[PDB]
Structures are given as C-alpha cells and as structure tokens.
Amino acid sequence: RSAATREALITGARKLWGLRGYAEVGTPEIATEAGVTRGAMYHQFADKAALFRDVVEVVEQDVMARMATLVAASGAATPADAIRAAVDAWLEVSGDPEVRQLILLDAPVVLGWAGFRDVAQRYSLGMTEQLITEAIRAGQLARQPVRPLAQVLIGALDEAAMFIATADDPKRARRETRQVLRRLIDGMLN
Amino acid sequence: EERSAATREALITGARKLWGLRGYAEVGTPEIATEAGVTRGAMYHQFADKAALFRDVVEVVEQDVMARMATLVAASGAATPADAIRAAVDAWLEVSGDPEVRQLILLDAPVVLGWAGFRDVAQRYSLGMTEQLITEAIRAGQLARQPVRPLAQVLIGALDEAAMFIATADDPKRARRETRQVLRRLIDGMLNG
Ligand SMILES: CC(C)Sc1nc2ncnc(N)c2[nH]1
Ligand SMILES: CC(C)Sc1nc2ncnc(N)c2[nH]1
Numbered sequence A: 001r002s003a004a005t006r007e008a009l010i011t012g013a014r015k016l017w018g019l020r021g022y023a024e025v026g027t028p029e030i031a032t033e034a035g036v037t038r039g040a041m042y043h044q045f046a047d048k049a050a051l052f053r054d055v056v057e058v059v060e061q062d063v064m065a066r067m068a069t070l071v072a073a074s075g076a077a078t079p080a081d082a083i084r085a086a087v088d089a090w091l092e093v094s095g096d097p098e099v100r101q102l103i104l105l106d107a108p109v110v111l112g113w114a115g116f117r118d119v120a121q122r123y124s125l126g127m128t129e130q131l132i133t134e135a136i137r138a139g140q141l142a143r144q145p146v147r148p149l150a151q152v153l154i155g156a157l158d159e160a161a162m163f164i165a166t167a168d169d170p171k172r173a174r175r176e177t178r179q180v181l182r183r184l185i186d187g188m189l190n
Numbered sequence B: 001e002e003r004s005a006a007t008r009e010a011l012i013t014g015a016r017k018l019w020g021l022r023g024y025a026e027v028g029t030p031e032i033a034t035e036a037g038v039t040r041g042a043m044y045h046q047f048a049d050k051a052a053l054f055r056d057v058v059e060v061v062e063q064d065v066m067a068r069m070a071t072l073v074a075a076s077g078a079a080t081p082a083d084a085i086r087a088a089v090d091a092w093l094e095v096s097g098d099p100e101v102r103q104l105i106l107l108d109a110p111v112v113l114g115w116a117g118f119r120d121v122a123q124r125y126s127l128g129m130t131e132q133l134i135t136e137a138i139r140a141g142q143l144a145r146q147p148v149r150p151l152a153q154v155l156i157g158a159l160d161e162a163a164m165f166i167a168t169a170d171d172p173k174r175a176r177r178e179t180r181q182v183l184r185r186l187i188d189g190m191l192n193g
Helices: A002-020 A027-034 A038-044 A048-073 A079-094 A097-137 A146-165 A170-188 B002-022 B029-036 B040-046 B050-075 B081-096 B099-139 B148-168 B172-190
Strands: none
Touching: A002 A027, A002 A038, A002 A048, A002 A097, A027 A038, A027 A048, A048 A079, A048 A097, A079 A097, A079 A146, A079 A170, A097 A146, A097 B099, A097 B148, A146 A170, A146 B148, A146 B172, A170 B148, A170 B172, B002 B029, B002 B040, B002 B050, B002 B099, B029 B040, B029 B050, B050 B081, B050 B099, B081 B099, B081 B148, B081 B172, B099 B148, B148 B172
C-alpha cells in the first residue's frame, strides 16, 4: 500500500536522479515516473531530501552486493589478492554512471560531509575490516588497529573515486589513480 | 574608514573566538557584535549575513593552520623530503587536534560552506603544499616517479578521514595514537628513505 508507493517513488527517483542529477529533477516529475499523485508522494516523503536518503540506502545496498560478487568472481587466491580485487571492484562499481551521479556527486552535497561519511562507513566498514583481519591472520599485513586502518583506507578510496568522477580525462584519471592505490596497498602488504 | 577596517578585524577575531568555543550554530551575530564592541549596523556594513562572516573566519583559520604546519615541519629538523613528509603528517594530526580547528574546520565548515564550498577551500590551502612535498621526494629518489596530483588527492582523502575520525572518536587520545601509527606505516611503505 504505502510500501508499494514508496518502492515506486524510490525506483523512479533512482532512475531519473541517476541520469540527470538530484538538482535537475523535481518531485512532481518523479511522481509521474512512479504513477503516484503528489498527495501520495508527500504522505511518504516530507521533502525531496527524505526521498534522496532512501534512494542512497537502496543504491548503497546494491553497491556492496556488486562489490562482494566481483571479489568472489576475481579468483583472488590470498587475502592480499582479495584486497587488491576489492580496490579494482570499487573503481569498477563507482564508475557506473548512476553510482557516480548519486553516491560520488549528489550524496556529499545533499547529505553533507558528515552524512555521506556515516552512510559510506555504515555500508563499507564491515567488509573493509573483514579484508584487513583476513590479511593479518594470513601473515600478509602487520598486526595493527583494524578500525583506524579501515577508516583511512575508506577515506583514500572515496577520494580516489571522487577525483575520477570529476576528472577532465576520466580514462587517464582512473588508470593513474588505480596505480596510486596499488602502490599504497602494496606498501602495507607482504 | 579606519574605524571600519578596525571593525572588520574585531568581528573576524570575536567570531573566530566564540564560534571556536561554542560552534557556529550556538552563537548569533548580535553576541559577536557585542563581543567586538560594534553596532549591528557596523557589522551589517562589513558582512551581508552570518555565513559571510563565517567564510572570512575560515580563511584566517586556514591561513594559520598552513602557517603552523610549515612551522612544525621547519622545527622537526627534517633534512630529507621523506622526513619532511613524515613531519607534515604528524603536524596535520597536531594542528587538526587544536580545539578551535576541530570546531571551525572539521565540524562547522562542511555544514556552513556546503560540500562544494568546503572542498574548494580545503584544496586551495592543502593541494599546493602536498604536491610540493611529493615533487621534492620524487626529485630526491625517495618516491617513485608518478603523476603528482592523483597521489596528492588520495593522500589528502586519507589525511582528512584521519582528522575527522579523531575529531569524533569516543577516545580521541587513543584514536590519534592509533591513526598516527597507521599513517606512518602507510607512508613508510611508499617512501624510499
Ligand atoms: C569497498 C570499500 C573497500 S570502499 C567504499 N567507499 C565507499 N563510499 C561510499 N559507499 C560505499 N559503499 C563505499 N565503499
Ligand atoms: C595539507 C595536509 C595536511 S591535508 C589537509 N586537509 C585539509 N582540509 C581542510 N583544510 C586544510 N588545511 C587541510 N589540510
């Protein structure tokens, strides 16, 4: 009922904002894409930013699912190779035009830095801490505090993706950034 | 004329002090005018609104952050580019740990300036110094030849997240010790020297 309306609105908002950006699409156009009235939409979402918060949750769930599948697919043989594949998986997924627009460009603006940090960490800290713990257990990464390392790596990878997202030559930005991240990772791994 | 130049400096000083202590959201422009000893009319002549005064406060705070980083690196006695990078990382944790810098740069500025605004300021102050330390290390053979701007950007993201993690940690003393250790391991893995 309400759940059907909310799911229609989130789907339509993800599609249209994914293509043209948060700033360029109003709630009435999203209501039309979804097949609901303005009244029904206003009942479910106070304002545009509330609908965007639910869009970011569903997109982040999909980002983390896709990254897990690419890492499972990579044929990584050790925890060190799992971390290298996880970095390749992030650059691949964050290079999706919808992810670029909603997560890398719009979410930091609409959510704020604190908001974006909270979402990024809520979705990514667990996977990141896991990869670090497995590398430490396999003797391929120095025993060190896991959470601070995970935090710093997430900040590095988020900034890498945002640099590529806004680069004048994104093809070259991506190749050069991937080399930077490999050197950084490889200096930690043994 | 001289009265107005004095008023502008008094407002920036008083706003920096009070917002530094209690946060942007907790201090209004009337209290800042009173602190500075000027009328609301004199404050309104200098600053269209509260956020315009905050933008000028961020500029003098950022100038002092970058000056203090340069001072702490000069004071380290670093003799090589590699040792200057190690000193610069320790200097950022020290400077970003100043309670006024924490409150105005790490907490208030992203909110008041917005994302685009805050990133533009952060880059204007930090990218130059960072790229210079990287170029010197590459020239000295202490860092592999590579494109400078992508490395600078990734390291700035790492260092910004380190500072924000300490700023909001349950135990900031421990967060800072542990973050300093992981950043030292990270740069020592990349530096030939
Ligand atoms: C996969 C991780 C090693 S890196 C990462 N950064 C992120 N930022 C925003 N949303 C996410 N899901 C992120 N994941
Ligand atoms: C230059 C390096 C220590 S990293 C750095 N990130 C920053 N963010 C905001 N304002 C600054 N001055 C910053 N410096």
